Scaffold this active site. Structure first.
Site, PDB file in Angstrom:
ATOM      1  CB  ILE A  22      28.635  31.545  36.405  1.00  0.00           C
ATOM      2  CG1 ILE A  22      28.569  30.605  35.233  1.00  0.00           C
ATOM      3  CG2 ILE A  22      27.755  30.994  37.590  1.00  0.00           C
ATOM      4  CD1 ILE A  22      29.031  29.129  35.559  1.00  0.00           C
ATOM      5  N   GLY A  23      29.178  34.338  37.769  1.00  0.00           N
ATOM      6  CA  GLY A  23      29.151  35.068  39.030  1.00  0.00           C
ATOM      7  C   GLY A  23      30.514  35.365  39.602  1.00  0.00           C
ATOM      8  N   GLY A  25      33.120  34.425  42.627  1.00  0.00           N
ATOM      9  CA  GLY A  25      33.569  33.595  43.742  1.00  0.00           C
ATOM     10  C   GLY A  25      34.409  34.378  44.730  1.00  0.00           C
ATOM     11  CB  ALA A  26      36.130  33.246  47.837  1.00  0.00           C
ATOM     12  N   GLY A  28      37.708  35.523  42.786  1.00  0.00           N
ATOM     13  CA  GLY A  28      37.607  35.890  41.383  1.00  0.00           C
ATOM     14  C   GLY A  28      36.359  35.515  40.651  1.00  0.00           C
ATOM     15  CG  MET A  29      34.401  36.086  36.129  1.00  0.00           C
ATOM     16  SD  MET A  29      34.824  37.003  34.617  1.00  0.00           S
ATOM     17  CE  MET A  29      34.258  38.576  35.076  1.00  0.00           C
ATOM     18  CG  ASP A 140      30.310  27.094  53.941  1.00  0.00           C
ATOM     19  OD1 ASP A 140      29.380  27.336  54.700  1.00  0.00           O
ATOM     20  OD2 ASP A 140      30.678  27.882  53.028  1.00  0.00           O
TER      21      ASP A 140
HETATM   22  C1  N8L Z   1      30.703  24.640  44.392  1.00  0.00           C
HETATM   23  C2  N8L Z   1      30.074  25.049  43.105  1.00  0.00           C
HETATM   24  C3  N8L Z   1      30.907  26.025  42.330  1.00  0.00           C
HETATM   25  O1  N8L Z   1      31.999  26.430  42.730  1.00  0.00           O
HETATM   26  N1  N8L Z   1      30.388  26.435  41.176  1.00  0.00           N
HETATM   27  C4  N8L Z   1      31.016  27.514  40.401  1.00  0.00           C
HETATM   28  C5  N8L Z   1      30.026  27.759  39.275  1.00  0.00           C
HETATM   29  C6  N8L Z   1      28.728  27.367  39.853  1.00  0.00           C
HETATM   30  C7  N8L Z   1      29.078  26.073  40.621  1.00  0.00           C
HETATM   31  C8  N8L Z   1      29.119  24.880  39.719  1.00  0.00           C
HETATM   32  C9  N8L Z   1      28.003  24.387  38.976  1.00  0.00           C
HETATM   33  C10 N8L Z   1      26.612  24.856  38.892  1.00  0.00           C
HETATM   34  C11 N8L Z   1      25.909  24.707  37.707  1.00  0.00           C
HETATM   35  C12 N8L Z   1      24.614  25.149  37.633  1.00  0.00           C
HETATM   36  N2  N8L Z   1      23.985  25.722  38.655  1.00  0.00           N
HETATM   37  C13 N8L Z   1      24.649  25.870  39.801  1.00  0.00           C
HETATM   38  C14 N8L Z   1      25.950  25.454  39.953  1.00  0.00           C
HETATM   39  N3  N8L Z   1      28.383  23.314  38.269  1.00  0.00           N
HETATM   40  N4  N8L Z   1      29.690  23.123  38.539  1.00  0.00           N
HETATM   41  C15 N8L Z   1      30.150  24.044  39.402  1.00  0.00           C
HETATM   42  C16 N8L Z   1      31.570  24.026  39.843  1.00  0.00           C
END
Ligand code: N8L
Length: 340
Positions: A22-23, A25-26, A28-29, A140
């Site tokens: 997905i991407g 985070g602060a 880690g992956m 936040d």
């Molecule tokens: C606070 C959200 C977070 O930490 N996420 C990590 C992966 C994205 C987000 C998350 C989603 C999400 C799904 C689809 N589109 C955007 C976000 N669903 N659950 C989470 C934890």
């Protein structure tokens, strides 16, 4: 061997399969995966905080908060994956529900109906009532931290800057650096506040409401002090009474140095908005934090009358009231319940 994603260990174990990146985070992956026990896809964040005290503090606070909280409009932690021993633990993986989208992605592409704005705002405030009832501040709130499923049920996510409220220790000097996302910072952050009062979160909700009405951030400051000039460019110059509430001389004299700025009427900025939505927006985006509406008052506002039901807006049973080696131990302990 472990699951690999983009050449990196993503060791979630046989319960979680079919990983997709997905991407970042602060710490880690982040990936999605299939949960072979609950038969749904889930979100998984890899967190590697143990080299730094501050990373350990943010990780431990979020884990403690989210494991204690139980509310329909707040993301939970479904599982936490880590090694069996402290010696072998270098990463933690937090497993959460995978939603359809977030409000940031939705606002980029989709016009919201008034009914959707109303419903989203209700759920944000319903979740926030619970958070604030536990003596916690999110700190936040912003569209990307608001998650939506396919039927528009909403959950608040990302407690990585959350703190226990501390209104008696909120005062600080002018131009104090701040951690949370710039565009959603209340004016007092730049003047005399550490963001340790519940009113900090209400401002951010007001910014989110404005952004739902127009699909654009209301106060897109480019740097620290520009954020305040955006805010004053719409609210106009503060009143004498509101200035008198700012005792810090540097902050007060900054505001006194500025040319007069007129208030921009909300109905001119948001010509398509419901009049009751703008009345509530005005109350959330109030310059003086002591005059700013609190979460329960907002729930009771006429805009939300179709939804308001205090008996179905629960509060927390159990409100809240070190070197990195010690924090690693506390994270190990806090995550022990998820071991087999
Ligand atoms: C606070 C959200 C977070 O930490 N996420 C990590 C992966 C994205 C987000 C998350 C989603 C999400 C799904 C689809 N589109 C955007 C976000 N669903 N659950 C989470 C934890």
């Amino acid at each position: 061997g472990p699951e690999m994603v983009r050449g990196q260990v993503f060791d979630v174990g046989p319960r979680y399969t079919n990983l997709s990146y997905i991407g970042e985070g602060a710490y880690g992956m982040v990936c999605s995966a299939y949960d072979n026990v609950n038969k749904v896809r889930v979100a998984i964040k890899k967190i590697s905080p143990f080299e730094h005290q501050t990373y350990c503090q943010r990780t431990l606070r979020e884990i403690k908060i989210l494991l204690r909280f139980r509310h329909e409009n707040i993301i939970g932690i479904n599982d936490i994956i880590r090694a069996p021993t402290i010696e072998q633990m270098k990463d933690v993986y937090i497993v959460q529900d995978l939603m359809e989208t977030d409000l940031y992605k939705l606002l980029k592409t989709q016009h919201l109906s008034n009914d959707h704005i109303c419903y989203f705002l209700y759920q944000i405030l319903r979740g926030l009532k619970y958070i604030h009832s536990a003596n916690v501040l999110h700190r936040d709130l912003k569209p990307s931290n608001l998650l939506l499923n396919t039927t528009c049920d909403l959950k608040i996510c990302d407690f990585g800057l959350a703190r226990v409220a501390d209104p008696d220790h909120d005062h600080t000097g002018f131009l104090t650096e701040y951690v949370a996302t710039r565009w959603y910072r209340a004016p007092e952050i730049m003047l005399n506040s550490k963001g340790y009062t519940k009113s900090i979160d209400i401002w951010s909700v007001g910014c989110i409401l404005a952004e739902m009405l127009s699909n654009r951030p209301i106060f897109p400051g480019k740097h620290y002090l520009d954020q305040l000039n955006h805010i004053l460019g719409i609210l106009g110059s503060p009143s004498q009474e509101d200035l008198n509430c700012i005792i810090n001389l540097k902050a007060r004299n900054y505001l006194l140095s500025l040319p007069h700025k007129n208030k921009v009427p909300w109905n001119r900025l948001f010509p398509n908005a419901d009049s009751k939505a703008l009345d509530l927006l005005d109350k959330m985006l109030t310059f003086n934090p002591h005059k700013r509406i609190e979460v329960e008052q907002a729930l009771a506002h006429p805009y939300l009358e179709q939804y308001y039901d205090p008996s179905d807006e629960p509060i927390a049973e159990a409100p809240f009231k070190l070197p990195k080696e010690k924090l690693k131990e506390l994270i190990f302990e806090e995550t022990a319940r998820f071991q087999p």
